[PDB]
Amino acid sequence: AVGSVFLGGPFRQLVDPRTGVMSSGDQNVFSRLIEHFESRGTTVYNAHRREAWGAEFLSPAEATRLDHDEIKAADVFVAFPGVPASPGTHVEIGWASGMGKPMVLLLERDEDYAFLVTGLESQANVEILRFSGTEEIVERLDGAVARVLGRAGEPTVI
């Protein structure tokens, strides 16, 4: 039973400047994943919900500290690197892989991602989950999380 997960992905890039929040459509995948884990007893750390989807942003300094500390606390790191790339999420991918965390990276099917992201497969404790929709993520995530977590602490190149 997975104790806790950190869920990362594009955020500021998805906030509508006119309303100051993410659209319901853009929130959907995050809320679905949050509920998915929490209903199974897994605590979820996630900036989007923490900062009310854009309405209660923290400062650069406070966001940085919290994201880093919650990634360090969480048993598993799950994140969308983003199309286009989320720069903040890529920093977090660095933090998590540098900590030797079990990681599931959620990559859009047929989209291009960076070499230092796809190259982490078999260099770190990482599973890539390519997806074409939210239901597919929900159906496959538990198996992926379980596989990486099963190898937690085992030595990697990183």
Numbering used by the authors: 12 to 169
Please share text taken word for word from the publication where this structure appeared.
5-Hydroxymethylcytosine is then released via hydrolysis of the N-glycosidic bond of hmCMP by MilB. To a less extent, MilB can also directly hydrolyze CMP to ribose 5′-phosphate and cytosine, which is further processed by downstream enzymes in the mildiomycin biosynthesis pathway and is incorporated into the dehydroxymethyl mildiomycin as a minor component of the fermentation products of S. remofaciens. Although MilB belongs to the nucleoside 2′-deoxyribosyltransferase (NDT) family, it catalyzes the hydrolysis of hmCMP and CMP rather than hmdCMP or dCMP. In this study, we determined the crystal structures of wild-type (WT) MilB by itself to a resolution of 1.8 Å and its catalytically inactive E103A point mutant in complex with its natural substrate hmCMP to a resolution of 2.4 Å.
In the crystal, there is one molecule of MilB per asymmetric unit. However, a dimer is related by the crystallographic two-fold symmetry. Our size exclusion chromatography result also confirmed the dimerization state of MilB in solution, which is consistent with the quaternary structures of both Rcl and purine deoxyribosyltransferase, two members belonging to NDT family. The final model at 1.8 Å resolution contains residues 12–169 of MilB for each protomer (the full-length protein consists of 170 residues), which possesses an α/β-fold with a five-stranded flavodoxin-like parallel β-sheet with a standard order of 21345. The β-sheet is flanked on both sides by α-helices in an asymmetric manner. In the structure of MilB alone, Arg23 exists in an extended conformation. In the crystal structure of MilB by itself, Arg23 adopts a relaxed and open conformation, with its side chain completely stretched out. Its guanidinium group points outward, facing away from the active site of the hmCMP-binding pocket. By comparing the structure of MilB by itself with that of MilB-E103A in complex with hmCMP, it is found that Arg23 in the substrate-unbound MilB faces outward from the active site pocket and is about 5 Å away from the supposed binding site of the hydroxymethyl group, forming an ‘open’ conformation. When the substrate hmCMP is not bound to MilB, the conformation of Arg23 exists in the ‘open’ state.
